[PDB]
Each structure stands twice: as structure tokens, then as C-alpha cells.
Design a protein around this ligand. Structure first.
Ligand SMILES: O=C(N[C@H](CO)c1ccc(F)c(Cl)c1)c1cc(-c2n[nH]cc2-c2cccc(Cl)c2)c[nH]1
Length: 344
């Protein structure tokens, strides 16, 4: 089962937790700190896109330190670049993720409130570093037995660049469909923080209902679902969309009215539906920002600005990775991981 999982002398006792495209995660015993950790094997070097997501996660996570964000406490790889085929990343061990919880567990308002807070608290740190996660969703939210939440997988994360956000209509995207903001299908590259707030809103809705709020089955169908609930965008909102093919598509649509949140979520806290509304606002300029969300009445019993830390060192203009070849991406992954080598 546990294939070629070659963590050195330090980590023993492996258990298969899960898999993915180009890697595997197992639990293991840290014979140094005596604590049982999580280790993720990565085999990305064949594809440039994988090397690009591996490099992004490592640069960022090594520079981040926050309780609601997953850490990288160690990295294991071959001593030379020629010999390095895989990379192992040691990270926090968490019992489950939110995606698995929503399948079998119904969350109490208290849990929804607490999970939401921790997501926003950690998102604040990320955004304060001028970084967008860009792939927030239930499966990227980890929980332990005492319901501590940590955000993971920054393979899609980018440095904010709102000046280069505008793009054409139905422009290709990578992040998960159900949690994709409307503007992504319209005129946005997803380079503004408002992208994350939308996903978090979709996650809030899903926590109230245990099912996706906008479960589109393909690219354009995603927009249909969102507009089916939010209704036709106002004139003022349409004017913010200057692209003609995007505006005209929205104009070609029949008028639809807003479907009441309380109609969708009968048992839901009204304070929760009010915030949900602010998060799932069509216009990304009007959409609530992370610090407003934290200060929202629904999260009153947790809100504490001084206990909600921001990044010490924010990333500057984007990392320029989209350009470099696999070969150069492997070197950068090599040099970024050097510090964890005993020969260092
Ligand atoms: O980076 C992590 N996961 C990303 C996306 O979620 C990933 C999963 C597979 C893969 F093949 C890749 Cl490339 C990326 C991660 C999870 C845990 C992690 N601690 N404790 C438990 C886990 C865990 C929970 C559920 C499922 C898994 Cl599998 C692991 C650490 N780090």
C-alpha cells in the first residue's frame, strides 16, 4: 500500500491517509519530537505545471506562520538534484478535512460559526501577505479532533495583482468550479483578494446545507447556478463590467429575481445569512473583505483584532514562475529546500 515512501531515519510508522495527482500523504512518527506527523510525497518533476505548484506551496508555506494555516516543519529530498525524483513535505497531522465531514456530519451553528472564524482568521493572514489562495474549498480545510482548522495546499496561490485582473469572456481557469467567483467566467483572471471571499461564502453555504450551493456540471453552467440564486445583476453592477461579450451575455438573459437565503436555508442563523449575503455579492468591488467578515456580528464571540495576526513579510510582485521550464523549476525547488538538509 505505502509505496516507495522513503522518509529517512527520523520518521517511522507510516499510515496511508490519502492520495492525489502527483503525490501521497501518510501519517508517521517523528522520532525526534516524538510527535506523530503528516508527510506528503511529491513526484512533480515530469510536468512543469506540477513543479510550478510545488514551488509555490513551498516558498509560501516556509514563509508563513499561522495557526489556521498548515505549516512545513521539514522537507526530505535527495542530496543532489540528479538523484532527486521525489520530495517529501512534513506538515501538521490532522484527523480529517471539511469535505469528509460534510458528507456524514451535520454541523451545529456553533461549529459553523467556529469553523468560519478560523477560515477567515487564517485568510486574513494570507491576504495581509498580499497572497491569494485561489483554491479555497472543503477538502483544502483540515480539522483535528478538537476542531482546530488549518488551510492547506497553496499550489494555486498567487501574489495579488489587481491591476492585471481584467481578461476576456469565458477565459480558461484552474480553480475548483463550484467555488469559482462569477467574475472568473466574465472578465477576471482571479488576481484580487475578492476571489477567496467568494469561495469562503460558498463554503459557508455548504456548511449550512451539507451540499454545494452552486454545483455546476461544467464551465458555463457554473454561472447559471450563481445567477439562478442571486438573480439578474443590477444596472450599476453591469456598468462595472466593461467587456462587451461578457455584458451582452448577461444582457441576453431573462430577468430573474433573488432567491431568499432564508428560503434556501430555513434553519439557518439570520446573522449567518446576512454575512453569507455579503460574501456572495455579485460585484467583487462591493463584496465583503476578510476583515469586515471577521468583525461581522455573527462572529462576535470570537472576533478579536489583536488576536488575529497579519504577515510580517508580505510577498512582492508575482514570482514569475509561469514562464520557467521544468528544469529551472527543479533547481529552484532544490535551492528552496536546501536549508532542511543536514549538510547545511
Ligand atoms: O497538502 C496537503 N494536501 C493536498 C491537498 O489537500 C494534497 C493532497 C494529495 C496530493 F497528492 C497532493 Cl499533490 C496535494 C496536505 C494534507 C495534509 C494532512 N495532514 N493531516 C491529514 C492530512 C490529509 C487529510 C485528508 C487527505 C489527505 Cl491526502 C491528507 C498535510 N498536507
Amino acid at each position: 500500500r505505502g509505496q516507495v515512501f522513503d522518509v529517512g531515519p527520523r520518521y517511522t510508522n507510516l499510515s496511508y491517509i490519502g492520495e492525489g495527482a502527483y503525490g501521497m500523504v501518510c501519517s508517521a512518527y517523528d522520532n525526534v519530537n516524538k510527535v506523530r506527523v503528516a508527510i506528503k510525497k511529491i513526484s512533480p518533476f515530469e510536468h512543469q505545471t506540477y513543479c510550478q505548484r510545488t514551488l509555490r506551496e513551498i516558498k509560501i508555506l516556509l514563509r508563513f506562520r499561522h495557526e489556521n494555516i498548515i505549516g512545513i516543519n521539514d522537507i526530505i529530498r535527495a542530496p543532489t538534484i540528479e538523484q532527486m525524483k521525489d520530495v517529501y513535505i512534513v506538515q501538521d497531522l490532522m484527523e480529517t478535512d471539511l469535505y469528509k465531514l460534510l458528507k456524514t456530519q451535520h454541523l451545529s451553528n456553533d461549529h459553523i460559526c467556529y469553523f468560519l472564524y478560523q477560515i477567515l482568521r487564517g485568510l486574513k493572514y494570507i491576504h495581509s501577505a498580499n497572497v491569494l489562495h485561489r483554491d479555497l474549498k472543503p477538502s483544502n480545510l483540515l480539522l483535528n479532533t478538537t476542531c482546530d482548522l488549518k488551510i492547506c495546499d497553496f499550489g494555486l496561490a498567487r501574489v495579488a495583482d489587481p491591476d492585471h485582473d481584467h481578461t476576456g469572456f469565458l477565459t480558461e481557469y484552474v480553480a475548483t468550479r463550484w467555488y469559482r467567483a462569477p467574475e472568473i467566467m466574465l472578465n477576471s483572471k482571479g488576481y484580487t483578494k475578492s476571489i477567496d471571499i467568494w469561495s469562503v461564502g460558498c463554503i459557508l453555504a455548504e456548511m449550512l446545507s451539507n451540499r454545494p450551493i452552486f454545483p455546476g456540471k461544467h464551465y458555463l453552467d457554473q454561472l447559471n447556478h450563481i445567477l439562478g440564486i442571486l438573480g439578474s445583476p443590477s444596472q450599476e453592477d453591469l456598468n462595472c463590467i466593461i467587456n462587451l461579450k461578457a455584458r451582452n451575455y448577461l444582457l441576453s438573459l431573462p430577468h430573474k429575481n433573488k432567491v431568499p437565503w432564508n428560503r434556501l436555508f430555513p434553519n439557518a442563523d439570520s446573522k449567518a445569512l446576512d454575512l453569507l449575503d455579503k460574501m456572495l455579492t455579485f460585484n467583487p468591488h462591493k463584496r465583503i473583505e476578510v476583515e469586515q467578515a471577521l468583525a461581522h456580528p455573527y462572529l462576535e464571540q470570537y472576533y478579536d483584532p489583536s488576536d488575529e495576526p497579519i504577515a510580517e513579510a508580505p510577498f512582492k510582485f508575482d514570482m514569475e514562475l509561469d514562464d520557467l521550464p521544468k528544469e529551472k523549476l527543479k533547481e529552484l525547488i532544490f535551492e528552496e529546500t536546501a536549508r532542511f538538509q543536514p549538510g547545511y
